[PDB]
Design an enzyme around this catalytic site. Sequence first.
Site, PDB file in Angstrom:
ATOM      1  N   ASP A 104       0.833  -1.190   0.000  1.00 56.35           N
ATOM      2  CA  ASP A 104       0.000   0.000   0.000  1.00 56.35           C
ATOM      3  C   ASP A 104       0.877   1.253   0.000  1.00 56.35           C
ATOM      4  OD1 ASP A 104      -1.986   1.878   0.211  1.00 56.35           O
ATOM      5  OD2 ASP A 104      -2.824   1.127   2.094  1.00 56.35           O
TER       6      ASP A 104
HETATM    7  C1  LIG Z   1       2.089   9.762  18.540  1.00 53.71           C
HETATM    8  C2  LIG Z   1       1.451  10.606  17.441  1.00 53.71           C
HETATM    9  C3  LIG Z   1       0.587   9.703  16.568  1.00 53.71           C
HETATM   10  C4  LIG Z   1      -0.293  10.531  15.638  1.00 53.71           C
HETATM   11  C5  LIG Z   1      -1.496   9.691  15.217  1.00 53.71           C
HETATM   12  C6  LIG Z   1      -2.122  10.268  13.950  1.00 53.71           C
HETATM   13  C7  LIG Z   1      -3.206   9.312  13.459  1.00 53.71           C
HETATM   14  C8  LIG Z   1      -3.967   9.961  12.307  1.00 53.71           C
HETATM   15  C9  LIG Z   1      -5.137   9.073  11.898  1.00 53.71           C
HETATM   16  C10 LIG Z   1      -5.929   9.779  10.802  1.00 53.71           C
HETATM   17  C11 LIG Z   1      -6.407   8.773   9.760  1.00 53.71           C
HETATM   18  C12 LIG Z   1      -6.685   9.514   8.457  1.00 53.71           C
HETATM   19  O1  LIG Z   1      -6.221  10.586   8.274  1.00 53.71           O
HETATM   20  S1  LIG Z   1      -7.728   8.754   7.182  1.00 53.71           S
HETATM   21  C13 LIG Z   1      -7.698   9.816   5.712  1.00 53.71           C
HETATM   22  C14 LIG Z   1      -9.014   9.675   4.955  1.00 53.71           C
HETATM   23  N1  LIG Z   1      -9.322   8.269   4.794  1.00 53.71           N
HETATM   24  C15 LIG Z   1      -9.500   7.727   3.462  1.00 53.71           C
HETATM   25  O2  LIG Z   1      -9.745   6.578   3.320  1.00 53.71           O
HETATM   26  C16 LIG Z   1      -9.340   8.630   2.244  1.00 53.71           C
HETATM   27  C17 LIG Z   1      -8.683   7.836   1.118  1.00 53.71           C
HETATM   28  N2  LIG Z   1      -8.209   6.578   1.661  1.00 53.71           N
HETATM   29  C18 LIG Z   1      -7.273   5.756   0.916  1.00 53.71           C
HETATM   30  O3  LIG Z   1      -6.897   6.112  -0.151  1.00 53.71           O
HETATM   31  C19 LIG Z   1      -6.787   4.431   1.508  1.00 53.71           C
HETATM   32  O4  LIG Z   1      -7.737   3.955   2.419  1.00 53.71           O
HETATM   33  C20 LIG Z   1      -5.447   4.601   2.227  1.00 53.71           C
HETATM   34  C21 LIG Z   1      -5.151   3.343   3.040  1.00 53.71           C
HETATM   35  C22 LIG Z   1      -5.499   5.792   3.182  1.00 53.71           C
HETATM   36  C23 LIG Z   1      -4.332   4.811   1.204  1.00 53.71           C
HETATM   37  O5  LIG Z   1      -3.856   6.119   1.313  1.00 53.71           O
HETATM   38  P1  LIG Z   1      -3.722   7.024  -0.056  1.00 53.71           P
HETATM   39  O6  LIG Z   1      -4.741   8.137  -0.025  1.00 53.71           O
HETATM   40  O7  LIG Z   1      -2.341   7.629  -0.126  1.00 53.71           O
HETATM   41  O8  LIG Z   1      -3.958   6.145  -1.261  1.00 53.71           O
END
Ligand SMILES: CCCCCCCCCCCC(=O)SCCNC(=O)CCNC(=O)[C@H](O)C(C)(C)COP(=O)(O)O
Lengths: 60, 84, 347, 395, 127, 39, 216, 134
Positions: free
Chosen positions: B41
Amino acid sequence: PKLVYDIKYFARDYRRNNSYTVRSVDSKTPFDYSKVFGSAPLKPADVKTVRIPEVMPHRG
Amino acid sequence: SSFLPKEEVESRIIAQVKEQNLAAGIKVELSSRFDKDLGLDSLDKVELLISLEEDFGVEVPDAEIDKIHTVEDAVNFFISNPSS
Amino acid sequence: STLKPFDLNANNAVRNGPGGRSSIGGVVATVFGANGFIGSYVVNEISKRGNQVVCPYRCNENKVQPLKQMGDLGQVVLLPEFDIHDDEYIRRAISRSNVVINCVGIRQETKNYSYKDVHVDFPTRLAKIVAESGKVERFIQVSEMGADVSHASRRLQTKAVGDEAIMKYIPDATIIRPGNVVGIEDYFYNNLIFQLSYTIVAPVINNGANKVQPTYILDVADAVVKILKDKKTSGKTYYLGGPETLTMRQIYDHLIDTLRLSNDDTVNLRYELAKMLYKPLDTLRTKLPEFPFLGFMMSSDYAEEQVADSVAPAGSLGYKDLSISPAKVTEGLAIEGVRFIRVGGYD
Amino acid sequence: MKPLTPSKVSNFTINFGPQHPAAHGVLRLVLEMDGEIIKRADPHIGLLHRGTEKLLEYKTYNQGIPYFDRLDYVSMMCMEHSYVLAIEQLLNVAVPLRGQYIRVLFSEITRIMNHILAITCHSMDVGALTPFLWAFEEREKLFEFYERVSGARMHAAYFRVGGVAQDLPIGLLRDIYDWSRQFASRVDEMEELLTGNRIWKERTIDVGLVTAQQAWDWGCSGPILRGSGIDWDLRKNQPYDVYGRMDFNVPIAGHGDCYDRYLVRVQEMRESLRIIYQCLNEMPDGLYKTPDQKVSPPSRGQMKQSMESLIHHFKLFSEGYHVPAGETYRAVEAPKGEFGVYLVSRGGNRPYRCKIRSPGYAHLQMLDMVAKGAMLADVVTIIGTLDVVFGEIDR
Amino acid sequence: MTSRFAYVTCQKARNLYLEACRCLPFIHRLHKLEEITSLKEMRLIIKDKFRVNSPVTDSRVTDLLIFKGREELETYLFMYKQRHHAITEYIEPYQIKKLLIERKSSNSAFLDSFYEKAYPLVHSKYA
Amino acid sequence: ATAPQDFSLAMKKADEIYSGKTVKAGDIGFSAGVPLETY
Amino acid sequence: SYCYARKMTDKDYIAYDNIKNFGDNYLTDYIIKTVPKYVTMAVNGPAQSSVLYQEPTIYTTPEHIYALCAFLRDHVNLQYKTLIDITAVDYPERSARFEVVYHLLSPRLNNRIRIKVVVDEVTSVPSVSRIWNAANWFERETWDMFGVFFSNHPDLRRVLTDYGFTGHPLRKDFPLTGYTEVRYDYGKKRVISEPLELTQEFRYFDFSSPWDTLSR
Amino acid sequence: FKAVADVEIDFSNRAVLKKYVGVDHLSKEQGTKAKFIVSLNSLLEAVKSVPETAEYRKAIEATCQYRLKVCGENNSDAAIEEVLDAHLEELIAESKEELRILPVLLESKPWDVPADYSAPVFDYVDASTILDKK
Ligand SMILES: CCCCCCCCCCCC(=O)SCCNC(=O)CCNC(=O)[C@H](O)C(C)(C)COP(=O)(O)O
Ligand SMILES: NC(=O)C1=CN([C@@H]2O[C@H](COP(=O)(O)OP(=O)(O)OC[C@H]3O[C@@H](n4cnc5c(N)ncnc54)[C@H](OP(=O)(O)O)[C@@H]3O)[C@@H](O)[C@H]2O)C=CC1
């Protein structure tokens, strides 16, 4: 107290007797600036003031 | 333009590529697209690049990350860069 | 993961809730020695899951303060006046209890209590009192790994005799036998650190050859929980050694490394010399009260137990039978307490 | 071909934690400072956020009055006053004159206690401890009046929709009048010790300077406005009770510094004393709560003698009154500024939305602009003049 | 100045993940987490945190999710949250999962939940 | 059934003037930030 | 403009007659006629300033909010120099759930105005901080409590809720008690968060009457 | 209002008053009548950009004409202050504040609406009016 033996709530019911009317306003009709500034003072003598309300409404 | 031996850097990068859960089994060599051959991925690609950051003490541009696609491309990028 | 019931008779009826602090667990426990290092964690594990814990303690309100927070309202019962020689009090303490855990032990002798009293007389009397009741379903006794009848040290010998007496009176009792327990309030690392830093010289019996298997306190507490959640464990002795076996020299060296001591302060106080320096001081202890200046380390019993290898027997029950992976005591959270002192970037 | 000039960098991102000689409550303050001078202040709040606004939504209107008492533990009466005024506006309920007088009287009393605490705690933060202890005896004298009228020294819950909970006990007006005869002398004693003192002057002058434009821009109210030259008082510009009858003068200063606001607060205490004297002399006789028994509970003998009064008592102490669908924002001149409640009703017996507008929220937001270029010692004084209460800030 | 020779965001989450990975050493040093956890170990957790929100496809919801994740990163980076918060919420569960030994249950998923509790939807603590 | 002829008039009128943008089913639940086991 | 103290004595008046009239009865018509594109509907209702008078409420769309606020602050006749507060109300029955409410004061007019922007969870509202500096914290609070995103905000962060809080509490779908609880553990010498358990559950008392008519 | 300064100063001087209340912060200029006239005429010149048949432009024209009249009959600068209920300095700042938003109004052009534009207005009727009498 004149409410001891004379009970009539519907005459004294202000809570449930409020209503909302409806109007439509349009931009075509010009605003009346004569109302706003015709009554405005042009000199210190013509100044009129609104006095502070002394009490809020009470039933008595 | 190869600053360091081609065999060493390729062996090291494929060693780190093996560490990822998949990307192994029958095909860990050159000419293997990260997302079209190895099942990786995009986030896994970024993490592998960060692991190569730790291995080879040199940063990768994000636009270069947009440009890298294959095992050849990553080894070419790391050999090209003088800090290596 | 699926929560496993406490294997106690008629638990299925009484139990209700998710298993948390405010939930109802069908376990009423009398933990003797609750205010101690081992006992406090056992009380925490039992009470954390909504169970009720009766904690008999010798009068000391400040020492039993942490136990107050352990459980919800009415779950942690603190009985004010505990005496090992009072039968009626012991019967009252275990009146409503269906599991009894005995963590009562003394590292050193005093004038009031000797090893033979605490480690032999109390287990036998408590064993009889528990046996006559019948309501108590599970009995767990905590002992050292090196405890043996044929042991030079009096502490480890009396402990084994008391364990045999308990096994005689209650056949279904489980004898938990952990190694040197590492914790924030432990007497292993804390005593070693105090020896290295606030003592003129750190005497090491022989050259540290004796092998030990230290274990983390959370691991022993979880092992207790797994003992109580399985009835098949009854009647068996579990040697809860740590994942790694280490000689005392390795532990001393690694403490020196972690603390970033300037150099090695440990000296070679070989055996046959501690047996002459501390031999009168044991008789000194038996006629004087508890004194912080001298204790535990400065005894012939400690020297006798530090000349043998306190390791689990090969054929033996352990953490694997309880499906627990013990955590390493030389790395991770276990070693944070000594780590906070100094790491060479600190002060 | 002309050389460029470089600049300097700021570090020392300190954390100024909960600190006792400051405005009461818990303050976590992260300050970035270039040397001994502050460059940014970021107050961290939420340490006393109790979810008050959402709890109101699950309670009936009468069940939610004590929330407003506990929003500001320094000034209870003014805080509950806005809530009861908003419910009265939505209910279209008219308050009898005696209850209106009692509300104005106790609002002025709580204003005085608030100003006493503000001034003396500010002096304590500076480092003078005698006015503080000299003031507690007065504040006790006023707490005894509270305990007389309501039975609670702090959280009275005395103001109710349509009037007051109980009538004034016999003998109360004389005691308040005696406290008033001696209050001016006590205030003069405090004023001599504080005003004119060289260390106090040096500590407070030209600290926390605010201009009228800045005050309106940041939404400040009350003493902050009046210390900068703004002749704006809700009690006069937007009267809400028999305050319109009352005769008192707005105190005005122009510099906007800490000293000007201290002087304003002292003069506000004097004006509140004048208003209390007028209330005492003109206190009417008659009903203290509204005659309508569909919004106010009947008296106990009346419920014990009449069937309709028992029905009304039962339905008011179980269900409560139903407030007609509507929205209103009612604000009162609280001692700390302008306190308002935005009440949204959908026609039920519980509020749908009760937004609380904090006067101290905007002052704490203004902290960063005010505390620019100051020192570690100046922060305590600047916080003192804002007089922020964090239970009031964090609802 | 001219000659003929002279002139001749679907991946927002990837950028957010790159920011988190690049900022990881700073929070390790700021939160005194060197000894407890490794950079690789946290990089593994961050991917799962990202993967929990995979199903969403709307751009606006994606924007909100990215903004909230950036807030989560900023809390640790700016020292709003503390060392014990990082221990409790990320490092400890991952280490617990690694140290976990479990017996492969012969009973199916239904049987285990049936034995455990009447209402499967209610959570279990200290499993 | 006729009309309330009160604040509900403006409530309904605000309802009919305004509208919400269409999103895929379940997407808002992720934005809510509550535990996903709630759904 | 700014109510700088001018008259030393006899300023007993609440305000002048003309200033009261222009705002008592011409204010809504004046706003609609002057800036028609911004306004969608207007409501005159019970007064915020007082019980007896009436102040306008204007409904506008999110795109026009910044220009409407700039017009309201700096127009000569209408000088709403102050932003009292910014608030949102959740209406789950509506497709556009949230109504962002702006409360303003004109010191010159001695008047209050209320501005409402109706949005949903996905749409964003432009920040008005450049018009009123007080907006910054109010919009941060609205983002924290309701989840309404404010565009071009200098730094949009949560204010009231605990660190690591992801839910928006004042949403009508959020449980009153929440989802998690905080406890100190003896084993791990840390204060930790756990799923909620209640010793005594919150008791909802349903007091609604069939015969009531005021409920809309 | 009441001054909170123990020092005795004369508030009828009409300059000590302004110094006390801090009008100098608003503007360092004296703020004479001619400046007010210039500001009003500059506002009138500025609002020329707005189309002639725009309600906003008519409003600004009417207000500027009213204030130029009020300047006309009143020869005293204090008299203008009394009629307009403001200090001359803030009256002058008013026209500049009006000037700031002309660019923002010329970017969106609120006055452009279709010839069928209709804004519904809801008005509240108090029960006190109907109950007491009709
Ligand atoms: C200690 C500090 C830790 C910090 C923790 C931070 C945790 C942040 C969690 C937030 C999660 C998000 O943002 S989720 C962002 C929005 N979620 C989505 O699914 C939009 C598009 N998703 C996809 O394309 C695929 O699922 C993907 C696997 C993402 C492939 O990444 P790419 O788009 O490149 O292809
Ligand atoms: N290193 C370790 O921690 C290991 C411990 N064990 C065994 O576990 C047991 C306890 O462990 P630990 O908790 O470390 O020992 P502690 O001494 O820390 O706990 C001892 C407890 O027993 C109580 N106690 C001791 N003597 C008496 C008495 N005469 N009458 C009443 N109460 C008494 C103490 O109460 P008070 O505080 O009032 O004395 C204290 O609560 C011991 O038997 C020990 O050998 C097993 C393996 C290793």
